[PDB]
């Protein structure tokens, strides 16, 4: 189990090679924040594979110089490169060479003979090398090694310092010059240390903090201050000073983050009537099919869930859950009755009687063909139902053929009477109330639409969330967006009036499209953040002041000025000291 502990101030390192002097110099650079937890390890009875994250701190407490190795990378599959580092008999030995790794890669110790630990040639860290893109060669003590990869550069820093503490990272400040830069170009998501096996060490993780360094005359960083650590240190980053003297400094701002979002669209969003297509009492027959315009409305497929439904459902263009997710343009649901097998014959590229003659659909048609038995209804003896048994071409896209004209087989003109091979091309289906599955009529419907590209007539039902109050939320109403605190407001909006507004021309009230009511809006919070402090010469204790909020969204004293955190109201009244606002003067003493 990882035993954490308190980083204190370690992990500062010369962010560049520049020299400076006596100059507090802000810098925004991946560091190890102060007082963070470090994931602390041992060597006893301990070198797991860890995430590399963005970078890594590291240390060890070496009286024994045992922790000699590092293996970095992502896969560690020997296929990519991996760094390797070995510090042995004062000769540093370094490689990016590629090789494949042990269950427990390490170095050996054969305890106590002429060669102490022996087992230099232990060297079971790995299978064997493969490809090499680089080479270089060269509790009292502590070795702090920062590692980070940026722009082909892995990078190292170091310090070797004497200490005496057995337990933990000594509390004191010193910072880490670079040793190296390696222009390797690996990607590294993980790494593992390596050891000489027969001793503590640590890990941090670097974060994009911004610190205030302080160089000294010789140019050595003698101190640092984390900006984000805590108010007193949000100040010192403002002034560029370690000394922060009395009075109220304004560091930063605070904007209450929104809860989630609110999407709201006018109830019912009207409707698209596929019923009077599908449930129309007298269908036009297949041979003359309805073409029926449907518009300004919302994909209505929620009526089509409850019914005996439809002997088939085929709608060509796009996914049937894009019925209700995708709006269409020219929407014609084609109301007609066909004989049973004729659902095949209604489809693009169909050779067939329906297709080639009475009801013909395009190869480019995007939409439906849907069957159901009307033998349960349309059957009688009904010979009014009819079809084009023969015609001299295919119908043009969505075209109909109405012809009662004589079908003329021979060059002998029939002239409106019957004769030898004189035909009336249209013919009827006798419906026999004993009709079976092959003989049953199928009422069949076809939705004309472009897919996209023209206005939404049949639309998709658009998801309107629920409504929350008194709580900062993002929102959209009816395409009006913004972010606010939606409350209940007596603002009597006009019947046709949508928004409200305000002298500054800033959206204010709205009316809930579904249920009609006057919601205010209200900005989120803002406020500055002022940091009251008695001069750092006196204390380190600061009392933040959140200007101009009510104390929630944050020993708290709500003021006329704002939400004051960290000071103790006092009935007594003394002369002013660090004037805050509205007559409230903080001061340090008991």
């Amino acid at each position, epitope marked *: 189990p990882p035993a954490y502990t308190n980083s204190f101030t370690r992990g500062v390192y010369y962010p560049d090679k520049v020299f400076r002097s006596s100059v507090l110099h802000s810098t925004q650079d991946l560091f190890l924040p102060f007082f963070s937890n470090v994931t602390w390890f041992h060597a006893i009875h301990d070198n797991p594979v860890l995430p590399f994250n963005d970078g890594v701190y590291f240390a060890s407490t070496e009286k024994s110089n045992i922790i000699r190795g590092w293996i970095f990378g992502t896969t560690l599959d020997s296929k990519t490169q991996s760094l390797l580092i070995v510090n042995n008999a004062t000769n540093v030995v370094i490689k990016v060479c590629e090789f494949q790794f042990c269950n427990d890669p390490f170095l050996g110790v054969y305890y106590h003979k002429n060669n102490k630990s022996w087992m230099e040639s232990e060297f079971r860290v790995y299978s064997s090398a493969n490809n090499c893109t680089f080479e270089y060669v060269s509790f009292k003590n502590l070795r702090e090694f920062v590692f980070k990869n940026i722009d082909g550069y892995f990078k190292i820093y170091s310090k070797h310092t004497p200490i005496n503490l057995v337990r933990d990272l000594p509390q004191g400040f010193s910072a880490l010059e670079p040793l190296v830069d390696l222009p390797i170009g690996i990607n590294i998501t993980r790494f593992q240390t390596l050891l000489a096996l027969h001793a503590a060490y640590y890990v941090g993780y670097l974060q994009p903090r911004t610190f205030l360094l302080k160089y000294n005359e010789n140019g050595t960083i003698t101190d640092a201050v984390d900006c984000a650590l805590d108010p007193l240190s949000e100040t010192k980053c403002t002034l560029k000073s370690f000394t922060v003297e009395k009075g109220i400094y304004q560091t930063s701002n605070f904007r209450v983050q929104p809860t989630e979002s609110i999407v709201r669209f006018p109830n019912i969003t009207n409707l698209c009537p596929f019923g009077e297509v599908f449930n129309a009492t007298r269908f036009a027959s297949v041979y003359a099919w309805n073409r029926k315009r449907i518009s300004n409305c919302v994909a209505d497929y929620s009526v089509l869930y409850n*019914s*005996a*439904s*439809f*002997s*088939t*459902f*085929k*709608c*060509y*263009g796009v*996914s*049937p*859950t894009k019925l209700n997710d995708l709006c269409f343009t020219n929407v014609y649901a084609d109301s007609f009755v066909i004989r*049973g*097998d004729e*659902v*095949r014959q209604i*489809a*693009p*590229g169909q050779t067939g009687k329906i297709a080639d003659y009475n009801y013909k659909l395009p190869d480019d048609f995007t939409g439906c063909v849907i*069957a*159901w*038995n009307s033998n*349960n209804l349309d059957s009688k003896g009904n010979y009014n139902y009819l079809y084009r048994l023969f015609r001299k071409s295919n119908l043009k896209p969505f075209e109909r053929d109405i012809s009662t004209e004589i079908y003329q087989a021979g060059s002998t003109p029939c002239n409106g009477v019957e004769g030898f091979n004189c035909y009336f091309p249209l013919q009827s289906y006798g419906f026999q109330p004993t009709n*079976g*599955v*092959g003989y049953q009529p*199928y009422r069949v419907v076809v939705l004309s639409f472009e897919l996209l590209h023209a206005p939404a007539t049949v639309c998709g039902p658009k998801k309107s969330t629920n409504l929350v109050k008194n709580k900062c939320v993002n929102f959209n109403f009816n395409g009006l967006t913004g972010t606010g605190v939606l409350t209940e407001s007596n603002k009597k909006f006009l019947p046709f009036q949508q928004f409200g507004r305000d002298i500054a021309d800033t959206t204010d009230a709205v009316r809930d499209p579904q249920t009609l009511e006057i919601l205010d809006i209200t900005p989120c919070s803002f406020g500055g953040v002022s940091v009251i402090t008695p001069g750092t010469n006196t204390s380190n204790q600061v009392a933040v002041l959140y200007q101009d909020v009510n104390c929630t969204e944050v020993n708290v004293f709500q003021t006329r000025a704002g939400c004051l955190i960290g000071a103790e109201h006092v009935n007594n009244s003394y002369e002013c000291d660090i004037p805050i606002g509205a007559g409230i003067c903080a001061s340090y003493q008991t």
Partner: antibody
Amino acid sequence: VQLVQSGAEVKKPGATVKISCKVSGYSFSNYYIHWVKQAPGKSLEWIGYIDPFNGGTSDNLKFKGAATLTADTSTDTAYMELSSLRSEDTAVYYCARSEYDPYYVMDYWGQGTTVTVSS
Amino acid sequence: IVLTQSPFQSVSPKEKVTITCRASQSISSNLHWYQQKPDQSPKLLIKYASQSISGIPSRFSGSGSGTDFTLTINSLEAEDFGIYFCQQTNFWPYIFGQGTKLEILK
């Protein structure tokens, strides 16, 4: 006569599985393909029919995977892409040879494709 | 437009069993019976509810009356029994029987 499916697909929930139904032994263009789901120890469940010549996807919605049935006419292989995977979609996905016209019969099928949808 | 089966039927060899497919409201005179062996693709026994695909035992028959469609087996063999399905026809997607595991005693 022959319908061969892509092997078992193990995904995390919310991911996508697409499954190949490879036709052989008959004419692909003359037969729709039914796509049949059997949840383990549960009943037969039909996700949709496809057309060889066209976009003939119908979708039983019920369980919604944003599914679309694509048929590859060169290789006679209908795909079922099942997205938005859920641990209940875990099942053996059969593809079933369908008639190209109204008489819906599935005489011959794939071998079934187990999909284990889990974290 | 959903159909109902009996979850289980236990019979003895040579005895006649009938497994029902009961569809809600309207029914379609076509139906399709399936014998699913354990861990194996169901196989269509009965087509249009009146017909066997070729090679299927003559003891495998089907029918329907009212809203019910029967899977009727005469003179069972202990090799025969298996999980049985009926498939709705038309009315949008074919709603397959919940399944019936047939047991044969003796």
